Design a protein around this motif. Structure first.
Motif, PDB file in Angstrom:
ATOM      1  N   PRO A  82      38.221  45.868  42.592  1.00 49.13           N
ATOM      2  CA  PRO A  82      37.586  45.028  41.591  1.00 49.13           C
ATOM      3  C   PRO A  82      36.675  44.049  42.299  1.00 49.13           C
ATOM      4  CG  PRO A  82      39.859  44.262  41.963  1.00 49.13           C
ATOM      5  CD  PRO A  82      39.633  45.535  42.781  1.00 49.13           C
TER       6      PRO A  82
ATOM      7  N   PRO B 127      28.795  35.960  17.625  1.00 48.21           N
ATOM      8  CA  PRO B 127      28.669  37.209  18.358  1.00 48.21           C
ATOM      9  C   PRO B 127      27.299  37.795  18.134  1.00 48.21           C
ATOM     10  CG  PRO B 127      30.003  37.565  16.358  1.00 48.21           C
ATOM     11  CD  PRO B 127      29.750  36.065  16.523  1.00 48.21           C
ATOM     12  N   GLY B 128      26.713  38.427  19.180  1.00 48.62           N
ATOM     13  CA  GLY B 128      25.364  38.949  19.145  1.00 48.62           C
ATOM     14  C   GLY B 128      24.318  37.891  19.351  1.00 48.62           C
TER      15      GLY B 128
ATOM     16  N   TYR C 213      38.476  41.707  45.533  1.00 53.43           N
ATOM     17  CA  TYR C 213      39.856  41.492  45.138  1.00 53.43           C
ATOM     18  C   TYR C 213      40.113  40.179  44.402  1.00 53.43           C
ATOM     19  CZ  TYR C 213      40.152  45.393  48.322  1.00 53.43           C
ATOM     20  OH  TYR C 213      39.846  46.615  48.961  1.00 53.43           O
ATOM     21  N   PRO C 214      39.403  39.778  43.334  1.00 56.46           N
ATOM     22  CA  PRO C 214      39.710  38.571  42.580  1.00 56.46           C
ATOM     23  C   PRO C 214      41.019  38.725  41.848  1.00 56.46           C
ATOM     24  CG  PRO C 214      38.139  39.902  41.313  1.00 56.46           C
ATOM     25  CD  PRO C 214      38.351  40.560  42.676  1.00 56.46           C
ATOM     26  N   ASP C 215      41.613  37.597  41.388  1.00 51.68           N
ATOM     27  CA  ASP C 215      42.873  37.537  40.668  1.00 51.68           C
ATOM     28  C   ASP C 215      42.796  38.352  39.392  1.00 51.68           C
ATOM     29  OD1 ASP C 215      43.578  35.687  42.625  1.00 51.68           O
ATOM     30  OD2 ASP C 215      43.746  33.961  41.238  1.00 51.68           O
ATOM     31  N   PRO C 216      43.876  38.912  38.851  1.00 52.99           N
ATOM     32  CA  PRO C 216      43.829  39.751  37.661  1.00 52.99           C
ATOM     33  C   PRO C 216      43.580  38.931  36.412  1.00 52.99           C
ATOM     34  CG  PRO C 216      46.132  39.443  38.350  1.00 52.99           C
ATOM     35  CD  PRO C 216      45.221  38.864  39.431  1.00 52.99           C
ATOM     36  N   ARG C 217      43.543  37.582  36.518  1.00 51.82           N
ATOM     37  CA  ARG C 217      43.427  36.686  35.396  1.00 51.82           C
ATOM     38  C   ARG C 217      41.993  36.252  35.229  1.00 51.82           C
ATOM     39  NH1 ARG C 217      47.658  32.049  37.412  1.00 51.82           N
ATOM     40  NH2 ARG C 217      46.144  32.298  39.204  1.00 51.82           N
TER      41      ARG C 217
ATOM     42  N   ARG D  33      43.546  45.309  50.172  1.00 46.31           N
ATOM     43  CA  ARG D  33      43.897  46.102  49.009  1.00 46.31           C
ATOM     44  C   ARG D  33      45.388  46.149  48.788  1.00 46.31           C
ATOM     45  NH1 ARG D  33      42.037  48.902  44.758  1.00 46.31           N
ATOM     46  NH2 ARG D  33      43.490  50.607  44.025  1.00 46.31           N
TER      47      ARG D  33
ATOM     48  N   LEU E 107      29.664  43.207  14.995  1.00 49.43           N
ATOM     49  CA  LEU E 107      29.084  41.977  14.504  1.00 49.43           C
ATOM     50  C   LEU E 107      29.552  41.667  13.110  1.00 49.43           C
ATOM     51  CD1 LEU E 107      25.445  42.649  15.827  1.00 49.43           C
ATOM     52  CD2 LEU E 107      27.209  41.165  16.878  1.00 49.43           C
TER      53      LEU E 107
ATOM     54  N   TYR F 119      46.642  42.747  47.579  1.00 51.02           N
ATOM     55  CA  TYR F 119      46.203  42.558  46.213  1.00 51.02           C
ATOM     56  C   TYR F 119      47.065  43.294  45.208  1.00 51.02           C
ATOM     57  CZ  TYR F 119      43.577  42.458  41.892  1.00 51.02           C
ATOM     58  OH  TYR F 119      43.266  42.307  40.524  1.00 51.02           O
TER      59      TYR F 119
ATOM     60  N   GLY G 107      36.750  53.131  44.549  1.00 47.73           N
ATOM     61  CA  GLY G 107      38.051  53.015  45.158  1.00 47.73           C
ATOM     62  C   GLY G 107      39.003  52.205  44.324  1.00 47.73           C
ATOM     63  N   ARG G 108      38.568  51.791  43.102  1.00 48.88           N
ATOM     64  CA  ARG G 108      39.285  50.962  42.152  1.00 48.88           C
ATOM     65  C   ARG G 108      39.264  49.520  42.585  1.00 48.88           C
ATOM     66  NH1 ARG G 108      40.648  51.564  36.908  1.00 48.88           N
ATOM     67  NH2 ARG G 108      42.927  51.001  37.158  1.00 48.88           N
TER      68      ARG G 108
END
Lengths: 258, 173, 175, 148, 99
Positions: A133, A198-199, A145-149, E59, D45, E62, A130-131
Motif C-alpha cells: 500500500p 457529493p459530486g 506501508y502506511p497504517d491501515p487506518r 512488509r 449522487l 506491516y 505486490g499488494r
RNA sequence: CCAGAGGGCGCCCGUGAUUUUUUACUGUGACUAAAAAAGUGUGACCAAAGCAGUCAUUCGACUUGAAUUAGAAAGCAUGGGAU
RNA sequence: UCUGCGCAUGGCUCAUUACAUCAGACGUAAUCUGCCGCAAAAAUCUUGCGGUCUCCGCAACAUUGGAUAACUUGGCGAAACGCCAAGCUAAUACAUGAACCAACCGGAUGUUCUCUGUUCCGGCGGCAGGGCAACCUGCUGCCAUGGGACGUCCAGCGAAUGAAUGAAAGUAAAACCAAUGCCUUCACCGGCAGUAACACUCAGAAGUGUUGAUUCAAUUCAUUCCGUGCGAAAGCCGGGUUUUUUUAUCCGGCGUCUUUUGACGAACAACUGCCCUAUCAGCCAGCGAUGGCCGUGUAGUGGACUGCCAUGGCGUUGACGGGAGCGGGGGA
C-alpha cells in the motif's frame, strides 16, 4: 513548455516590485505548485539577505551550504511550499516555513529536534504492485506501508532524521486545524462541522478561538494536532487569529508614537 | 494491564532508579517485600513496549526479569505435570497406539486437528526425561524428521471441563 | 495532413465554420493498417506518447481462448466466415475486431482429453461439467468458430475468444 | 444459452461486454429475465437505479446503468422538446438573462440533444434530469439519469 | 596476452621542438580495468540485493500489525460470546429454583 | 473485566411518501491573477511617485512594515418565506 | 571534434476570425508528459583456465566485442553554411553480457515408492471362452473424496486476450442427506462444550485498495510478447586508512536503463456572456446534414472516418448570409 515568468504574473506573496527588473524566476517543478511555492533565490536574497544579487545566490547554492528536508541541495531553483524545514548549518539556524496570518509566508524558528519533525497531508491512498500500500501526499512523497487506518486528507507525522512515519492524526471531529490557501491562510481553529455535497466541493465550517465562525473548503484543511495543547509544531507570529481593520490601524499608530 | 518486574532489586538502586526514571515514558517501579516490583501503567502500551526493551532499566548486580502481570509464570509451563506433544505427525495413518509405543510410556492422548503435525499426550511428571531423549533426537519416523516438546496447561482441569460440558448440555435442554 | 476535427464540418444550424488557424500535429489521422492472412509482417510507427505502436499486416496466427474453463492456446487462423461491417472485407479475409473466423481447433481437443495420480483428477473434472452440442460437433471435426476480440491493427497481435452457445447460435444462422 | 431474437435485428449481434451472459446454464430457464446475468451500476449522487436496468435484457453501451459511462461535474434540467430519433431525445432548457440598462429580463432557451437510455421514454412536456458524460456523438454529451 | 600489463606497452611517440626540451606523447587507456573501477562494481553487486531484502522485511512487519489488530478483534468477539452464553443460561436456570 | 431496560448521537446500506420538491429576490458566507482604480501607513526636501524605511546607538532593535475594499452576468453553500 | 542537454520558451506583429476566439465557473473514470521531487528493482547461465568432440572438470572485485570524427594522405569545384577516396584511433557513442550471490509465492505434474480405505455401487489394464466384431460372461492386479518422500516443467516487472476476485446489512425452531473437525470412550459408539484462517515446517507472514459513482487500482489462473519494452551505464570523479603506495580495506559525490505518480505543461469538451444589418428568412443531406448499430483511426473521447440502418437537426427568444473588428484585464 513555459520557461519564463514576468514579475506581475508571478505571486506578490514573494513581494516583488513593479519596477526594477522585468522577469521573475520560474522554479523547476517539484513538491509544490507554482502559486503556493516560493523559490530559493527569493528567500536568500530578499528576506534573509545573505545575497544582494541573483549571482550571489548561485554562489551559495551550487557550492552547497543549504539543506531542505535535511538533504543538501545543489539546485539554484527549487520549490519551498509549506511545512518545509530549511537549515543553513553555517549560521546554525533552522527555519520552518508556514502560512502566517494575513496571507504572508511565515518563517518561524524552531528547536533543533522539531526540525526533524514534518507533517504531510495525504491526498490519495492506493494499493501498488505486490499488494504494497502507498499513501501519496501533497508534497509528492510516497509513504510505503502506511497504517491501515489511513484515509484521504489526514496528516502523517514524518521523521526526517530517518525516513518513516510514526502515528497519524485524522481530520475527524473537532481538532486543531489550519487553512492552506483561499485567503483564510494561517488562521487556526477547531472543526465545528464537515458538510458534504457529493459530486462537488465539500464545505467545512471552522470556529477559531474567541468565536467568529467561518467556512472554508475541505481541500484547504490541513491538520496540526489533536488539540491546541497537543500541537507538535510551532505557530507563526500571530496565533491564527485575525482582527478587525479598525484595530490594525489603532495599533499601528500606538507603536508609531514610540 | 501493568507488568511485574522480578529478580531485581531488593531494592535500593531499584527505588532510586524508580523515581529517577519518571516520566518520558517509563512507568514507575513500586518495590516490595523480597526482590521484585509491580510496575503500574494501565493502558497496555506497557505490554507492547516491554517486548522491545532492555532499556529504561538497570540492575545493581542482578539478572533482570520483565514478566507479565502475575508473579509466577515460567515454573508453571516448565514443570509440575509435563505436558507433552509431538509434531511431525500428519494425517496419513500410522493408526492409534503405535504412536504411544514409539514414544514409550503410559497412555492417554489424541491427535488434532486437520492441523497438521501435532498430537498431544498426557503423561505424568517423569516424561521430562523421555521427551529430552526424543527431542535431542530421534530425527525420524516415517518420511519426516521430528521434535517433541512441552508446556503444561491441563490436566488439572480438562477432565472436569468436559464433565461439566456433558452436564451443561442436559441443563440447557 | 489528415486531421480529426469539427472545423471542416457543418454546424447543427447548417452553417459553415470559418478558419483562422492552420492544422495541428496534435490532431492527426493516419492511414488504416490492413491485417489479412499470410506471412506475418510488422511495421512500427512512432506515436505522440514517445512509444511505438505496431501495424499488423497479414497475421495468420492468433492466441485463442475457450470460454468458461478459463484457458487458451495458440492456433492457426484459416478463414473469415463473417463480419458485421461489410461483405467485401470477408472475401479478402481481413481481420478486424468482431469478425467471426475459423481456427485449427487442434490444441483444444488435446487439452480436453487431459481435462495413476492423474487418472482420478480426470474423473473429478468429468463430474459437474458439460458442453454445448453445437460446440462439440465442430470440435470433433477439427474446426471451430471464434471471434477476434483484440484489435490487430494497432498491436499487431490477434487474440480471440471462442463462441459459446447463446452467441454461437446467432452467427451460425446468419450463414 | 439460447438467443432472444426480440432484441436482435443486427448483423453484428449485441452482447453485454461488461459481464459474460452468453454462458449456457439452466439458471436462465423458468424465469422471465430475473435469473439472467446482468451488469448494474449505481449513480451515487442520489439517482436511484431503476428496476428495468437491474433485471432487464436491454443492451446499450451509452447509458450509465448498463455500461461504464460515468456521471461527472454538471447536472442540468430541462423539458422534452421532441421524442424523435432512436435512443436520442431533444431537451430544451429555458432561463432568464438580465440586462442592466433597461433593468429587465429576457427569455432565452438552449435547444440541446441528449442520448436517452432505452429504459426511459418520457412524453413531450415532461421534465428530465441529465448528467455530464464523455462525448457520445457530435452534439451529444449528456445522458438521462431520471425523469419526473 | 592476459596476466600481463598493457600500461608500459603503449606507443611512446617522441615529439621534438626547438627551444624546449623534448616530450613523449602516449595515449590513455580508457578500457583499463583498475582497482577503483572493480571496487565500485563490487559495491553495486552487494547493495542491489540489500534494498530488496529490506523492503520485504518492512512488509513482514506491516502485515504483522494488521494481524495483531484482527487478533484482538477475534479475542473480544470470542470473549464476549463465551462469557455471556454461560452467565445467561446459568441465571435463567437458577431463577427457576426460586420460582 | 456487567446480566437486563429502553436507549442517545456518529457511520453505511436497504425499505417506505396520500404526491416529496424547485426558482427569481434578499441577508450572510465560500470560491476568484497582478497591473489599473478606491483606500490605510510613511516628510522619496514637497509633488506625479514608491513599498519603503525608522530608531537607538553600534559590533541590532522594531518580532519592522508592505493593511484593506470594490471588481458585470453565470456558477457555489446556507438562512429568510412577503411578493 | 565526437557525446549529452537546450534552441517549440523569450522577442515581434494583429492578417484571418461571431456558437470562432476570449473571460468567469467546470470536467477529462476520455489522454500524453523530457528536465525536477519522493521512490521502487531477487527474470537473466556469464567469465577465465586446463584437458577435450562442437565435451567435461575446476576457478569466480566479469577479465566483453566491433567502428567513426577531429587528425593524416590524395583531392574535386567558377562559386557554394558544396562535396569525394584511402589510412588512423576514443566512449556515459554503438553492439554484446553477468552463473554463484537469491529470499518469498504458487499451479501443471511423473508410468518414482511410502503410509492407505478390514466394501462394492464404478472405472482402467491383462488372460481364457462365445461373438452378429456391436458385445457378453468368468478370473487376477491397481485406484476411488486421503498426506508424505523424491524427480520434472512453468513462475519477475511492462504490455495483449480470456476467466475469477475487487464483501455484506429481509428475525430464530432443529434434523433430513454426504464430507469433516472438535469433546468423549477402547472402538469407525455416544455427543456438540470449544471454534479467524490453519491435512506441514508462519498455532495472525492481508479474511478486507481508494472513490458520491468504476469494466479503474491490485491479486490469481490459462495462453502469450520475438524487437517496436526492461545493462548493476562492463560509466566518471573524490575522501581516507597504511606502512610496503599502486591493495577485494572501507566510505563519499556524480551519471544512466526500466517501472511507478505528484509537479511544470500539452491536447480535448462544456455551463453562462458578446457590435451593426431583414431593401439578408428560410438554412442543412449526391460527396455527412441529425441520430442509432458494428468497426477503423488517434495519446484519447467523438460522423473524426468507412460500411449498414433510421429521418432527423436549427429558426422571429433572428437561424443563415453580408459589413466592421484579434479577445479580455483595462483607458477616456
Amino acid at each position: 513548455t513555459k520557461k519564463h515568468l514576468k514579475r506581475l504574473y508571478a505571486p506578490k506573496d514573494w513581494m516583488l516590485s513593479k519596477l526594477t527588473g522585468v522577469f521573475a524566476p520560474r522554479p523547476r517543478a517539484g513538491p509544490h505548485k507554482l502559486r503556493e511555492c516560493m523559490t530559493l533565490m527569493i528567500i536568500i536574497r530578499n528576506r534573509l539577505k545573505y545575497a544582494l544579487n541573483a549571482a550571489e545566490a548561485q554562489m551559495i547554492l551550487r557550492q552547497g551550504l543549504v539543506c531542505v528536508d535535511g538533504k543538501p541541495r545543489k539546485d539554484t531553483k527549487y520549490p519551498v511550499g509549506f511545512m518545509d524545514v530549511v537549515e543553513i548549518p553555517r549560521t546554525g539556524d533552522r527555519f520552518r516555513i508556514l502560512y502566517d496570518v494575513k496571507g504572508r509566508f511565515a518563517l518561524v524558528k524552531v528547536g533543533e529536534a522539531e526540525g526533524n519533525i514534518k507533517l504531510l497531508k495525504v491526498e490519495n491512498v492506493y494499493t501498488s504492485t505486490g499488494r504494497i500500500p502507498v499513501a501519496m501526499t501533497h508534497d509528492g512523497h510516497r509513504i510505503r506501508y502506511p497504517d491501515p487506518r489511513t484515509h484521504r486528507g489526514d496528516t502523517l507525522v514524518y521523521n526526517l532524521k530517518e525516513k518513516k512515519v510514526v502515528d497519524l492524526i485524522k481530520s475527524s471531529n473537532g481538532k486543531v486545524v489550519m487553512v492552506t490557501g483561499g485567503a483564510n491562510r494561517g488562521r487556526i481553529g477547531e472543526i465545528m462541522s464537515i458538510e458534504r455535497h457529493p459530486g462537488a466541493f465539500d464545505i467545512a465550517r471552522l470556529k477559531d478561538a474567541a468565536g467568529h465562525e467561518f467556512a472554508t473548503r475541505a481541500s484547504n484543511i490541513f491538520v496540526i494536532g489533536k488539540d491546541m495543547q497537543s500541537v507538535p509544531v510551532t505557530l507563526p507570529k500571530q496565533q491564527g487569529l485575525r482582527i478587525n481593520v479598525i484595530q490594525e490601524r489603532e495599533e499601528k499608530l500606538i507603536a508609531a508614537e514610540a | 494491564n501493568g507488568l511485574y518486574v522480578k529478580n531485581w532489586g531488593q531494592g535500593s538502586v531499584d527505588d532510586a532508579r524508580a523515581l529517577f526514571g519518571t516520566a518520558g515514558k517509563v512507568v514507575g517501579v513500586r518495590v516490595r517485600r523480597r526482590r521484585y516490583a509491580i510496575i503500574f501503567f494501565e493502558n497496555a502500551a506497557a505490554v507492547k513496549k516491554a517486548i522491545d526493551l532492555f532499556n529504561g532499566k538497570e540492575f545493581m548486580g542482578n539478572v533482570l526479569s520483565v514478566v507479565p502481570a502475575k508473579t509466577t509464570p515460567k515454573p508453571d509451563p516448565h514443570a509440575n505435570s509435563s505436558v507433552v506433544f509431538v509434531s511431525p505427525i500428519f494425517r496419513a495413518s500410522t493408526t492409534k497406539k503405535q504412536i504411544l509405543e514409539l514414544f514409550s510410556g503410559m497412555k492417554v492422548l489424541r491427535l488434532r486437528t486437520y492441523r497438521n503435525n501435532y498430537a498431544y499426550v498426557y503423561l505424568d511428571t517423569p516424561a521430562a526425561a523421555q521427551r529430552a531423549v526424543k527431542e535431542k533426537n530421534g530425527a525420524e519416523f516415517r518420511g519426516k524428521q521430528l521434535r517433541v516438546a512441552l508446556s503444561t496447561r491441563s490436566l488439572a482441569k480438562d477432565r472436569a471441563r468436559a464433565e461439566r460440558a456433558r452436564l451443561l448440555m442436559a441443563a440447557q435442554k | 495532413g489528415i486531421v480529426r476535427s469539427r472545423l471542416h464540418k457543418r454546424k447543427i444550424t447548417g452553417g459553415k465554420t470559418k478558419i483562422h488557424r492552420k492544422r495541428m500535429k496534435a490532431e492527426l489521422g493516419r492511414l488504416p493498417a490492413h491485417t489479412k492472412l499470410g506471412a506475418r509482417r510488422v511495421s512500427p510507427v512512432r506515436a505522440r506518447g514517445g512509444n511505438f505502436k505496431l501495424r499488423g499486416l497479414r497475421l495468420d496466427t492468433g492466441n485463442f481462448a475457450w470460454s468458461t474453463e478459463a484457458i487458451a492456446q495458440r492456433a492457426r487462423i484459416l478463414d473469415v466466415v463473417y463480419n458485421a461491417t461489410s461483405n467485401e472485407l470477408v472475401r479478402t479475409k481481413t481481420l478486424v475486431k468482431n469478425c467471426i473466423v475459423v481456427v485449427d481447433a487442434a490444441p483444444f481437443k488435446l487439452w480436453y482429453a487431459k481435462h495413476d495420480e492423474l487418472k482420478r483428477k480426470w474423473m473429478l473434472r468429468r463430474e459437474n461439467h458439460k458442453i454445448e452440442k453445437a460446440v462439440a460437433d465442430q470440435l470433433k471435426e477439427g474446426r471451430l468458430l471464434a471471434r477476434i476480440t483484440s484489435r490487430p491493427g494497432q498491436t499487431a497481435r490477434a487474440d480471440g475468444a471462442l463462441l459459446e452457445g447463446a452467441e454461437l447460435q446467432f452467427y451460425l444462422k446468419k450463414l | 444459452h439460447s438467443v432472444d431474437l426480440t432484441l436482435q435485428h443486427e448483423k453484428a449481434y449485441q452482447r453485454q461486454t461488461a459481464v459474460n451472459e452468453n454462458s449456457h446454464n439452466p439458471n436462465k430457464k423458468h424465469v422471465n429475465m430475473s435469473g439472467h446475468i446482468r451488469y448494474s451500476k449505481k449513480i451515487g449522487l442520489g439517482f436511484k437505479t431503476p428496476k428495468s436496468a437491474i433485471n432487464g435484457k436491454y443492451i446499450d453501451r451509452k447509458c450509465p446503468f448498463t455500461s461504464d459511462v460515468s456521471i461527472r461535474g454538471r447536472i442540468l434540467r430541462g423539458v422534452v422538446h421532441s421524442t424523435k430519433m432512436k435512443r436520442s431525445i431533444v431537451i430544451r432548457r429555458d432561463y432568464l438573462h438580465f440586462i442592466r440598462k433597461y433593468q429587465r429580463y429576457q427569455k432565452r432557451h438552449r435547444s440541446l440533444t441528449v442520448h436517452c437510455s432505452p429504459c426511459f421514454d418520457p412524453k413531450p412536456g415532461d421534465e428530465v434530469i441529465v448528467g455530464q458524460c464523455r462525448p457520445l456523438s457530435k452534439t451529444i454529451r449528456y445522458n438521462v439519469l431520471e425523469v419526473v | 596476452s592476459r596476466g600481463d600489463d598493457v600500461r608500459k606497452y603503449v606507443i611512446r611517440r617522441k615529439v621534438v621542438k626547438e627551444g624546449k626540451k623534448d616530450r613523449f606523447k602516449a595515449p590513455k587507456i580508457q578500457r583499463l580495468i583498475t582497482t577503483a573501477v572493480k571496487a565500485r562494481r563490487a559495491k553495486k553487486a552487494k547493495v542491489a540485493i540489500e534494498k530488496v531484502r529490506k523492503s520485504a522485511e518492512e512488509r513482514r512487519a506491516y502485515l504483522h500489525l494488521i494481524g495483531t489488530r484482527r487478533r484482538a478483534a477475534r479475542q473480544r468477539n470470542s470473549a464476549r460470546r463465551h462469557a455471556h452464553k454461560v452467565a445467561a443460561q446459568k441465571q435463567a436456570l437458577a431463577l427457576f429454583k426460586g420460582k
